[PDB]
Design a protein around this ligand. Sequence first.
Ligand SMILES: [Zn+2]
Ligand SMILES: [Zn+2]
Ligand SMILES: [Zn+2]
Lengths: 342, 98, 44, 344, 51, 101, 24, 305, 98, 69, 42
Amino acid sequence: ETNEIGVPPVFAVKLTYPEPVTAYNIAELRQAVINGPDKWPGATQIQNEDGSLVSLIGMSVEQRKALANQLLTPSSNVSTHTLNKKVYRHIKNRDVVLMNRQPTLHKASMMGHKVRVLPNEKTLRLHYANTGAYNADFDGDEMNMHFPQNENARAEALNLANTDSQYLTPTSGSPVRGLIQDHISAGVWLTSKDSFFTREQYQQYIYGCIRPEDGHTTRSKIVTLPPTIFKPYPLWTGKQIITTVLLNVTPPDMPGINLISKNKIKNEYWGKGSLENEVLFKDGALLCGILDKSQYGASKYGIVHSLHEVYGPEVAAKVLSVLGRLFTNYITATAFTCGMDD
Amino acid sequence: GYVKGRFYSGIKPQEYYFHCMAGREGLIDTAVKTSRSGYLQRCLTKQLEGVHVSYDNSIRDADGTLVQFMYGGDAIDITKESHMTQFEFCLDNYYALL
Amino acid sequence: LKYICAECSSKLSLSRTDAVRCKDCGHRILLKARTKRLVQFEAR
Amino acid sequence: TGQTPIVKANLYDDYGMDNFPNGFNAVVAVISYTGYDMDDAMIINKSADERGFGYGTMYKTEKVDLALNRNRGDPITQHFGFGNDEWPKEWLEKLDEDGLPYIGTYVEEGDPICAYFDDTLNKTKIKTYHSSEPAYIEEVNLIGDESNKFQELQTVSIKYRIRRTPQIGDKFSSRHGQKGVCSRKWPTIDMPFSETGIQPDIIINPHAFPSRMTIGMFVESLAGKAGALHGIAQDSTPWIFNEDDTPADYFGEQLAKAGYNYHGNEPMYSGATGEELRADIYVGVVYYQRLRHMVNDKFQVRSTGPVNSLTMQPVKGRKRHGGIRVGEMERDALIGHGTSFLLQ
Amino acid sequence: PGQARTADFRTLERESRFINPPKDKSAFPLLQEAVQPHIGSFNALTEGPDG
Amino acid sequence: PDREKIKLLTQATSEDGTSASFQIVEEDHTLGNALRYVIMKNPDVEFCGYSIPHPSENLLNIRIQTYGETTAVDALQKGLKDLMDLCDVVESKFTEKIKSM
Amino acid sequence: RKDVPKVEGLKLEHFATGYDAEDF
Amino acid sequence: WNVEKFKKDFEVNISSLDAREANFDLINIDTSIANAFRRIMISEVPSVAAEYVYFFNNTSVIQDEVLAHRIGLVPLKVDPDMLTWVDSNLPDDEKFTDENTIVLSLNVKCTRNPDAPKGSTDPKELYNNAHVYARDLKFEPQGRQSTTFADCPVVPADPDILLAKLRPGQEISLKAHCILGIGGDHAKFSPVSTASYRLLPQINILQPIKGESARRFQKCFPPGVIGIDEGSDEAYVKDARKDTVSREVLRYEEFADKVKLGRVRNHFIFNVESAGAMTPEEIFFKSVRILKNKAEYLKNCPITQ
Amino acid sequence: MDISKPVGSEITSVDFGILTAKEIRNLSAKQITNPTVLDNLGHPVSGGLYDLALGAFLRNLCSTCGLDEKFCPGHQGHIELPVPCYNPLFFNQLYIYL
Amino acid sequence: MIVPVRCFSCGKVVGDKWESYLNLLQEDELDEGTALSRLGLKRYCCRRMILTHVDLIEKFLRYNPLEKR
Amino acid sequence: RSLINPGEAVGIIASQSVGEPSTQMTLNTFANVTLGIPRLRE
Ligand SMILES: [Zn+2]
Ligand SMILES: [Zn+2]
Ligand SMILES: [Zn+2]
């Protein structure tokens, strides 16, 4: 996701967080302690009520199982009776870190990302939509990952310094996050009038990019449109894929977006009588025009900035990630090339 | 140094040489005519670090000294400003905004 | 025969405080020979 | 393993450049497909890699010289070998009887690479291996001394061999200033595949071209494919072609005679969906160079670890679990957010 | 024919040369020519008609 | 048995079970694409697609929604069975052609 | 100026899978 | 759709079958399934290859790990069915059994030849055992294998593979353990020198083309693709199956108007080459079976909530 | 920092000032008088700069609090200057008034 | 250095083909593309492997520390 | 609802909104007045 950071297991296993043990989390922390220092998601040590630490490092599975069964024993001491044990658990996907690339010349060069642990990786993985903020090039430049250590700092990194909170720059109040390269080229193609998809393809593009098994349970059932061409053969257009995407990620108790905009490509390029330069959203449906660097690049008053205004930053960030997967998938399916002939 | 050649069909040796000149120019300029902005940024921030918006809407330094009476003369967050005068966009979309 | 002369290639061995040089050449530069010993590799 | 380039300047032969192969002929596709190849990142075929493509080695020579302390022709305190006091025994896994390491031995950080007996200590001590990158022993040279014999062994050179299979983050480049950082080793069943049933060794992204205008790479692509087909070296000396005799026409004619598309395009299929891609894609053979690492890349992580005596703040390190610095710029950023707890 | 110089792989010529390093003179005079300002100037310290 | 191979993602499966998401370990496009092709031939299926969260976690996500005649789990089973039968048809056909060749 | 010399005697060196040179 | 409707319409055509390569068409099958077989053939059909190499000595010019690597690329002519899989959770002693593993040895020393015809360049006559070939990997049977593999010694499929070169005084001494693996893990296990497909070309002419145009049009495609009919004198398509899809036609202005180039979307021309261990047809069978087991293994797994 | 070890006392301001020789003498844990720091067995010389009243040192315990090198915060001592010296930090101001 | 065993792209064994390829150019006096075809190298993938191989090893081999030059 | 929030470090932010964008003025094109960073320093 555009708000995540891909964390290599080599980090995930060494970075811990001090979780206090309670009725609501005793199941989880039991398992972590059993898992130990080296199996993720596990734990590296336990803090007792008298402040002392116990290392899980040298331990067998049985010794760990023993400690895991005494995580929540009552107090045998009046002075520490108000405290509970703490488990120094591994970092996991629930977590937030602070990412940083130097020089840090404005606050968007230090943002909060949601953790996503990725097997087999040896580097940090970062969605393109963030290069703008960090001024990152992928030429062997390095970033720092900081792991805040208490819930106040958690709350701040998830609500104040988080990537999604920083769509507009404070310099002029304009977008810094958007899609680039493959994704722009892909969009011009997918949203072209020449673009048609069968029921099978249409449904597959939708599910591959929605990720409905998320926090965007706007419904717990994916909604689709009827086809544009009913007969002789059921066909959907590319513009319908966009309408369907928005339809599945914008709030249902809320009318669809309305936008009259323009893109970078003159009508003349499509042929006589074209209106494809005009971008029209009516009630949340893309009725005319292709989508462009002007619409989901870092671009003032395009579709994603419009969505940001009407539905807030969470929805806009979600649309941006969704569109990203859609175009990534579309590219794996149809590709895009450049040659001598061009 | 008018080069009629194009990258597709290649450029003559004379054009090539002149085109090396043009290419090298910007790199020579970054080597010699580079001004750094770092020290300037440090000095602005170190002096401005504690200047903040107060609960009375004024802008104060940390010692209480009043720097401005209201942020832009108008109390507007720059990052919430994009659509404030985008009236026709707000009139369509009226109902969602409400 | 742990060592090899770097100049003449004669295989030869040393002892405690011995002439660090080839007993044939007199060249003072000796290569340690690879002797039969188990090193294990994965074919990847 | 280097190869001669199919597309060559004739002077490449005149300077005897084949005596020092500097690259290899890759099958390169100019395609947007993986999604991991934007911003000049590039893709290497996983099976290509596993079959030897671009494999390389690094050698380091260290000099161990225990006459380093001794005050000039002094009595000798330290001799290579083992004493008769009691010492580990695990040591003999790495070290031969002379106190030198057996040739071929795998050696990782902390292992012995040397054993000597120190007289002033009445103990047998051990020079250890320091790199965080493991290696194998290649040559061990006994550097004897002149000034007529009598002197026992005091100087040794150990040459380490370090494996470099191509990794994520390694840099690759054609001979046209199109440099790229490996983003993925893409599984070959997942690559696009040609009508000819070939998978590309390397992917370079079409978006890497319109800003750089390395049109010479596109020419090399046709010429190299045509050369591989006809068994032909192609001369790419500057200024042999012109506006009335273009290489795109010349090499294109050669491809057409071979039976491939005249523009150098080829039909391909998606490895994932199985279907033919929207248009023919540009593919050919381009000579590629693998760039050495210039940088101490290696990652680091610290939970806790050694602190400095005066400030009790994390030491600087990596090789010793040092902390990462939050400096003045990051301070200002944390204030700018209003995040006082993150700062705290 | 009797033409301009086209490209050759020189496969046999090369591989034989690898195996049989010339016993008379190097096959790449251009390479020796490139280093000539260094060898030449050093040689000038002791040659010349004047010591 | 083996319980770790396929699991229900209960946060995208409805009460009536006519809609569901499954997470299958150790499977990519190979089975995923083939399985959605087969499932979509089932006339009671209203929606189906597969996705791969990330190339680095061996995981495959299948979504099935039905028009209400069978449950989502039924469609998964008919699809899996249909797929098996489909392979048989291919194996047998290939055999005959090799013999007859 | 002379053009870059055409290489003489070039034939098909590619066939669809399942065919070879002497099928042509 | 319906599995019986599929059975009635599906069809196989076998153009050429051989011990090393197969050329055949699958007709009226969906791309998702053709693709499955293709992927499976490359990456999931098990094979035997050297995995662990144990050096006792190597004073050749080629470094151990590199030598080990090439040995791993040598395709062993071994039936993978004759072996069981290694369990990689046991210690090394328990890990390797007579059902698990095949042991190869290699033992060469290079000496100088006295009887060399003076003034010779050839290293065969200058040196004894200068060149080391795959065929020099000796198969050492363990336990029951003396019996099981008595009827089929373990031999590399390509004996004349050059493995290493030596000069007088240099020796190589190694044992290799060879086990089951799959291409997806490492390409040395892939049983193909490649399995791929193409869709059957569709050249459809949008109006008759005759006379001097016919001859012209015909020459835009490889020999035999386009026929000129006697009588109507018009051009027609003989077999698209020979076409390489060069799109050459589309260059000449007079034709670009009168031809569309497409595919028969559900007609796959497969070409399968074996690395040498199993026949093509076996490898394709094994893949069609592998796909079916995935579906079967999954149907029988309980769905955990 | 541990959320289960709260702190009640809070620092609210800091005052700058000058240490008087009377204060120092009173608070001092040991007057240091020996230039020599260690003896032949590597132990702290008494009345020297590593004197154990100034804190635990190596494997020795602090003579003032008894704690070891880990829990002993250290303690200050003083040298007696046999003759008054100008404090170099303030010498310019002294100069002005003089 | 020495012939690669398999073609980087095809997977096709190529390492048994170096010594013969030289003998084809040398003895049978063929051109390169004819000789490559005769060894079964059809895809340009595979032709590239043998066409452009540099047997650099034959240079390395002339420095043998284990014999009296 | 577009008001700046009590608590905002507008001072730090103004500093970054002048320093950061000025890194785009490290070089120059080709009245006659002083430009870019030198001027910003004056
Ligand atoms: Zn000697
Ligand atoms: Zn103390
Ligand atoms: Zn090949």
